[PDB]
Amino acid sequence: ASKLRAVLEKLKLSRDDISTAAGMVKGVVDHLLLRLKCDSAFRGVGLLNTGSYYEHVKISAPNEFDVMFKLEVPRIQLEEYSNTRAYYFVKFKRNPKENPLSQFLEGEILSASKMLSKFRKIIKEEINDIKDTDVIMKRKPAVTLLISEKISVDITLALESKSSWPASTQEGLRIQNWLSAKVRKQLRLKPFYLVPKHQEETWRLSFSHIEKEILNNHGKSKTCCENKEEKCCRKDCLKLMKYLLEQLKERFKDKKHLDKFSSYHVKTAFFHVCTQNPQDSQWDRKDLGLCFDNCVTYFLQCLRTEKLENYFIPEFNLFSSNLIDKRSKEFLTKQIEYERNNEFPVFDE
Ligand SMILES: COc1cc2ncnc3c2c(c1OC)C=C(C)N3c1ccc(Cl)cc1
Ligand SMILES: [Zn+2]
């Protein structure tokens, strides 16, 4: 309760410092954006979101920065890597003007592996040219860097499609009773992205932009969190959920049980709790303890039932036995139940 606000304030202590690191990050990205716009196929490249910390909100350790590069690919033809609902092959509709991505084609399909390797090469060729800071490219996110040994920058390359969302998403983003039918309509008119996540020809759908948008305009009231009277704890509940998983993942690092779990799981579950608790009166700042519990309780029910539907792709189950093993889900359940029933000691000093 007061224990939870102490943790959120402690999570602020680190966030206050970031100001020096954010500037060093932007200097590298912009120099890499200019070197890419030189290339024939990467002329339409650019960063997704413009804001502070450069989309750092993933890890509560303020050193890991995640940046997304986008590239508009018009007249796109998506062919589902059938029955998966989320992974697609990239085909091209009409051939009057030859597309700059011809070099990455593997027949009709656009190879993500060929598209990545050239991208990965261009910047590695540019790192040795950098005389300002010390950049170390680690390959295992499409590309990763270690700026000044302290800063870690994970670069992701995404295709942008300004067309209608795939039929698999038709029944997703069920925000109607929370954010409204008007908002759903407006969000679905926005573009969608595809990330190289493999069959080294397949790309997975990305809605990181929609997610960010609904988190920064998350109430039923348009003035939610805009004044002292309408302050909810939606954002704090997500921050605590993300922090719980980070603390447990770090606790059991050399045990590989939680390797399949990520903050995406905790963000998905959170949006499902927002859909079931659509009223701003269900997220009052004074009720933080119970709201966080509602999030913990719902996550525990997802683990036990082995059902965590993708919030955009409802037939895609993130907790299927094909994605995460029963033992792994049962192991996370045991750890979270211990936390819940012991007043989250993993949050203590
Ligand atoms: C929009 O749809 C998705 C977005 C994602 N954004 C991040 N990570 C995602 C997704 C997934 C998606 O659904 C198809 C699915 C999975 C398994 N993961 C994921 C989760 C945990 C770990 Cl360890 C690695 C990857
Ligand atoms: Zn709010």
From Swiss-Prot:
The modification N6-methyllysine is found at residue 334. The modification Phosphotyrosine is found at residue 54. There is a cross-link at residues 12, 124, 182, 212, 239, 242, 255-256, 307 (Glycyl lysine isopeptide (Lys-Gly) (interchain with G-Cter in ubiquitin)). Residues 12-54, 212-235 are annotated as: DNA-binding. GO terms for molecular function: 2',3'-cyclic GMP-AMP synthase activity; ATP binding; chromatin binding; DNA binding; double-stranded DNA binding; GTP binding; metal ion binding; molecular condensate scaffold activity. The record marks 154-155 as: Cleavage. Changing residue 54 to A: Strongly reduced tyrosine phosphorylation. Its main location: nucleus. Its EC number is 2.7.7.86. ATP binds at residues 52, 64-66, 208-211, 242, 263-267. The modification 5-glutamyl glutamate is found at residue 149. The keyword Disulfide bond does not apply. Changing residue 340 to A: Reduced interaction with the SPSB3 component of the ECS(SPSB3) complex. It is found in: Nucleus; Chromosome; Cell membrane; Cytoplasm, Cytosol. The N-terminal disordered part (1-160) is phosphorylated by AURKB during the G2-M transition, blocking CGAS liquid phase separation and preventing activation. Phosphorylation at Tyr-54 by BLK promotes cytosolic retention. Localizes into the nucleus following dephosphorylation at Tyr-54. Phosphorylation at Ser-263 activates the nucleotidyltransferase activity. Dephosphorylation at Ser-263 by PPP6C impairs its ability to bind GTP, thereby inactivating it. A motif (Nuclear localization signal) lies at residues 134-140. The modification N6-acetyllysine is found at residues 212, 220, 222, 242. The enzyme activity is strongly increased by double-stranded DNA (dsDNA), but not by single-stranded DNA or RNA. DNA-binding induces the formation of liquid-like droplets in which CGAS is activated. Liquid-like droplets also create a selective environment that restricts entry of negative regulators, such as TREX1 or BANF1/BAF, allowing sensing of DNA. A number of mechanisms exist to restrict its activity toward self-DNA. (Microbial infection) Nucleotidyltransferase activity is inhibited by different herpesvirus tegument proteins (Herpes simplex virus 1 tegument protein VP22, herpes virus 8 protein ORF52 and herpesvirus 3 tegument protein VP22/ORF9). Viral tegument proteins act by disrupting liquid-like droplets in which CGAS is activated, thereby preventing CGAS activity. Zn(2+) binds at residues 218, 224-225, 232. A motif (Nuclear export signal) lies at residues 8-13. Binds 1 Mg(2+) ion per subunit. Is also active with Mn(2+). Mn(2+)-activated enzyme forms an inverted pppGp(2'-5')A intermediate, suggesting a non-canonical but accelerated 2',3'-cGAMP cyclization without substrate flip-over. Mn(2+) ions are coordinated by triphosphate moiety of the inverted substrate, independent of the catalytic triad residues. The cGAS-STING signaling pathway drives sterile inflammation leading to type I interferon immunopathology in severe COVID-19 disease caused by SARS-CoV-2 virus infection. Tissue damages in the lung and skin lesions are caused by activation of the cGAS-STING signaling leading to aberrant inflammation. Endothelial cell damage is also caused by activation of the cGAS-STING pathway: SARS-CoV-2 infection triggers mitochondrial DNA release into the cytosol. This is Cyclic GMP-AMP synthase. It comes from Homo sapiens (Human). The lineage of its organism: Eukaryota, Metazoa, Chordata, Craniata, Vertebrata. The chain holds residues 162 to 521 of 522 of the full protein.
